[PDB]
Enzyme design. Structure first.
Site, PDB file in Angstrom:
ATOM      1  CD1 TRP A 137      -1.100  -6.810  -2.550  1.00 54.35           C
ATOM      2  CD2 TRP A 137       0.716  -8.016  -2.040  1.00 54.35           C
ATOM      3  NE1 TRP A 137      -1.287  -7.342  -1.295  1.00 54.35           N
ATOM      4  CE2 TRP A 137      -0.185  -8.084  -0.960  1.00 54.35           C
ATOM      5  CE3 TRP A 137       1.933  -8.699  -1.949  1.00 54.35           C
ATOM      6  CZ2 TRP A 137       0.097  -8.802   0.201  1.00 54.35           C
ATOM      7  CZ3 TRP A 137       2.208  -9.415  -0.802  1.00 54.35           C
ATOM      8  CH2 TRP A 137       1.293  -9.465   0.256  1.00 54.35           C
ATOM      9  CG  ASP A 167       0.025 -10.336  -8.646  1.00 54.96           C
ATOM     10  OD1 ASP A 167      -0.711 -11.333  -8.485  1.00 54.96           O
ATOM     11  OD2 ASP A 167       0.728  -9.862  -7.729  1.00 54.96           O
ATOM     12  CE  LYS A 196      -3.431 -13.064  -1.989  1.00 48.95           C
ATOM     13  NZ  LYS A 196      -3.105 -11.783  -1.351  1.00 48.95           N
TER      14      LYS A 196
END
Ligand SMILES: Cc1ncc(COP(=O)(O)O)c(/C=N/[C@@H](COP(=O)(O)O)C(=O)O)c1O
Lengths: 365, 365, 365, 366
Positions: free
Chosen positions: A102, A171, A195
């Site tokens: 990611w 992030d 999430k």
């Protein structure tokens, strides 16, 4: 009976879903759904202001920070962060720390808006965090980016890295509000709500107020921090329902003990699984180094470090038979991945822990 | 009961809202919620694909068009359309037909990505569609943009304009699936779901397959037509619940007669309200010329052409007492605005017609 | 439904009760019941030795500490610890710290076997721990006794006191294995199993192996530490089923993270109720000083510090209507008391939390 | 193959009793909780412990001037509690003891920690008889007289109530409690560990004449003092809740099976079956206990000869285990073989032992 170990979107608290269902047609007597609520109404203004207040309270967000809700998901910020901040210094350079898929995907996307430099050598495997003292920092870079919790590889930061004063973008989609955060040491914090803090559709961005107004000309208005913070996330029609849903999850996290309680629950949940992996006599193999093991995502292999395909398939088959969903790891890694977000209760982890213990006792030689 | 004349987000069918509530804790027996459902599961694969089939079926979309669902709203496409198409020709030129506030807002946004020329002269008031003959179109322009229906001013295209063969980009946010459309004549069609097709959070984008790949480098991947068409709108986590809601309204539009019935129903509702204005002897005044009157948004004034603030405040107060919400016109123009979208039943406009009729019978001198 | 907030005997883990039921007629295939099993069999030898190893592992018990299982409950050790230790020094003197009703009862019982001095000045109300410095310690006292958690008044030691090198005897009945404990600093630890670790019938005693043999002549043989330690708690028939029950509860404690995870859950549960009482604007009154507030037992009053009897009655009645048992306070203090032992889950406290929140929302002026 | 449990204590429980405990182990009679979770101060457990006391009084015909209490500590705990509560009844702190086996000897030794203990009869060369009461030397100034009704290890049982010339009588009936009617008026204190004949281990029943309270010593633990516990109705502290609930179910089972009167006739049938096999065994099985003192509960014996053939006794216990007949091995202090025939042991069980003993004799006798 269903135990949802989804990576993102993930499980929501059963109590939250019950309230959404009960007042789906008549939100607290108003006579309409949230799905029908105008974002310019007095009713929805109360909702989005409530959600913002909860984010500030739970994370202890200082007053000199703007809290905005945007669309586009996490990958939407892979573009929004360079568009808004890479012009902070005329060099158009930014530093990216690649610990997994990611931050890697975020570093590639950043090349569309400037010259991006990865701060460390490419790892043979995303199994550890490169030592922060080994970082090759560009003093003239606009910012320094990293991903706190790599959902695919299970690599998590348990510290705030020292970037020598540079503005720090993080992030946190895979661990947002799973622990107290020192917001002051960052420049921009973002996390997809799907999430650990809600459902898909909305993304939270926490921006320091002195970093607005550096957006490039090619930055969309709906994704510009100065524009949305200037309209209290109401520049256009925001995802009204995804903000309302998120506000209930925040209210749920508050009633269960804020972020300090989510940190303790994540330790109990992750350690329950890791104890079984470390004691598996090699039956279960987690490739991540102990000091960088994630507490939200636990990827491991069965049989050997490369993974016995037949053994892992019968693991997922009996897991589905026992109504434990979404345990199959990401496509790029295969094997098993167990996601342990805030809504995943201890009983859920205990169910998996007993299953991993009995699966070993009936397959290990 | 309650009658929601919302301008966006707007009323959803009661049949649809009843189903969303029933399955919210256990969608179709799978054991989880759509809010918990993973976009990589076979379950959600069936939902988003069925939504595409309905978009292609109800509008009769040719096979050479890609139907993708994106975030950002219609205000997001105000930047995505220039990003994906203004480089179609090397000049970075585009023609815009400002027919209202949303058309002007889209052209102003598009000036950050190239050289934008407004086609016709600036009208003193957004009360009519400039005759396409007076349109000055640069033939080396990348595309031509126009808004089929203006939400704030009530001017609608009852025809497809003749751009002499240029690629045609249209903004049908406020009249999408309110009538059949000859899709083959358009280059790119985009519409926000939240005011005719569903709930906020998602945007439909119909793009001709030959127009992909002309995106600029600054275009976010989550907003590039080539990228999302290559991943069937699953490049990142899409608004799962927003596409689930849209599919249900699409199914509802299908059971009720499709786009051919939506236009016939939208005629009855607009005719019932427009005749009341045309017979009011000046009590109700609509400044839009009849050949451009919208069947979706009918803004008007009370007392005189400029607006009697005393009579309009008493009109909205008595309307709120009758649980007729969101009749107040947009915060820029003022006055009254009645939104008559697909979910607004004939009984709903008949209650509005009866209220406007009797209100005239108590304040006309 | 049913949520058991019992003071002692308390709730058992539902998983444990299920296994006790499954093997009540045929324990692990041996053919008999644990109720029928002989303490001199090899089968019960595994049971009592497994329970001992769990007590040693979960508490990190040094190898110079005996772990014996006696009968008589907690009040049995009120007589057992003086009979076994008051003759350590010729004075037959003992120092007792009275922080609540249970330390006062043990202090009264010890008067039957020697000279018992209460160390601090007598408190007006058991709401605080007298500071360890204001303790009048006797250098020739045989031992110093205190109670780690006063079940009736909610006063818990979050520290191990300094007694100037004297042998320390602690009563951990109502907090045994609710937190890690430094066993090396203690001389004798005892705890009745019925509160946090088993069912009524058996008492765990941890004694440093150099304190045996100081037993008075009148010490009953079943309670003499030296005798029972030399027979592995099998000098006479021990409470077999109670030891077997405790072995399963200890096993449950281990699988959920041991004493480290129990402490983290103790804080989440206790603070969830304390936040409600503190933010209650005087509706709920807990007299304990915040630094000594117990994490296991939370006694409070409703209405005022003196207690609104009529209001507290509706509380316990409505609570019983909702199937929340044994919330009535101890008969000597009255009011309410919530017991949040190991088996009480976070789901349980959240139910009690939502109930107290609504009850305050409907009865505060 | 079903298990035959000849356990000496803890012993076999009735199958129907174990079925009820298993049934309501998670939701006792709809209350919603378990007996293992039940508060001893609730009304629900108040009925359990009151119904248990009512059954003890009914089945034994306990007069109203006797207190019935449930204590912890087992039988060996009462070895201390009896002197602690009663040796101070007379100033001399003297107590008379009748030693007929191992458990009466262990009790007499434990009572020396609290007073001057005197064994009223000349020592027995072997625990094979009850010394004639006419030969007892009773102290008239003794606080009480102690004796054990049934000796579990040696199989010597009283079939009479000894005349202590009016003294306070104390009796240890742990291995024959509610196997026969008892005239409780003749006794001052009766106690019995429940694990052997009336339930599961953990609780001890004690029947005390109400005028014997209040003579306890200063060193008697409160939880073992009869006055303290009889005042709190066995609830001075948390009692063994589950063991009192199990005891009531075993007592209810005895009542439904004919009470103490039927248990005595059944005990006769069971013990006779084995004793007849021994007496007719022509010395192959050797029980040294004299017939008038033979216990109907515990029948210890040797194989081959009076001293015991260890090989033959090893084959016996091994062949009995493969037949699922447990706990037939005698106590470790005597060795040999011990067959315990408590109330829960059915006639069909003794028949299995009886047939095996006849087949084993037909196969190894010379
Ligand atoms: C700290 C502490 N020490 C001793 C006891 C009693 O153990 P027992 O002696 O086995 O009953 C207890 C048991 N507490 C119980 C006692 O209740 P009770 O007054 O016996 O009904 C309670 O708080 O309600 C205890 O909490």
């Amino acid at each position: 009976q269903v135990v949802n170990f989804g990576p993102g979107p993930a499980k929501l608290p059963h109590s939250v879903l019950l309230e959404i269902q009960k007042e789906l047609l008549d939100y607290k007597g108003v006579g309409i759904s949230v799905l029908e609520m105008s974002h310019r109404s007095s009713d929805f203004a109360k909702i989005i202001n409530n959600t913002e207040n909860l984010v500030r309270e739970l994370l202890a967000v200082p007053d000199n920070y703007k809290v905005i809700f945007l669309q586009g998901g996490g990958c939407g910020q892979f573009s929004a962060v360079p568009l808004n901040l890479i012009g902070l210094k005329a060099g158009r350079c930014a530093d990216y720390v690649v610990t997994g898929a990611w931050s890697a995907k975020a570093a590639e996307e950043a090349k569309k808006f400037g010259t991006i430099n990865i701060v460390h050598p490419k790892l043979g495997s995303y199994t550890k965090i490169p030592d922060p003292s080994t970082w090759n920092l560009n003093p003239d870079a606009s910012y320094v980016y990293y991903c706190a919790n790599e959902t695919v590889h299970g690599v998590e930061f348990d510290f705030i890295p020292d970037v020598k004063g540079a503005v720090l973008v993080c992030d946190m989609s895979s661990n947002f509000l799973s622990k107290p955060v020192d917001v002051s040491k960052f420049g921009v914090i973002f996390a997809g709500a799907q999430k650990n803090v809600g459902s898909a559709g909305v993304t939270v961005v926490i921006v320091r107020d002195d970093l607005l107004g550096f957006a490039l000309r090619e930055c969309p208005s709906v994704l510009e921090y100065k524009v949305q913070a200037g309209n209290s996330s109401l520049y256009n029609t925001p995802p009204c329902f995804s903000i309302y849903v998120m506000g209930l999850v925040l209210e749920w996290i508050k009633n269960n003990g804020g972020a300090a309680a989510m940190e303790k629950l994540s330790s109990i949940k992750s350690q329950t699984i890791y104890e079984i992996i470390d004691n598996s006599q090699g039956f279960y193999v987690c490739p991540v180094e102990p000091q960088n093991r994630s507490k939200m995502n636990i990827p491991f292999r069965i049989g050997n470090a490369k993974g016995d395909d037949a053994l892992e398939k019968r693991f997922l088959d009996k897991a589905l038979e026992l109504n434990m969903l979404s345990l199959k790891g990401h496509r790029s890694v295969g094997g098993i991945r167990a996601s342990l977000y805030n809504a995943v209760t201890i009983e859920d982890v205990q169910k998996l822990a007993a299953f991993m213990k009995k699966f070993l006792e009936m397959h290990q030689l």
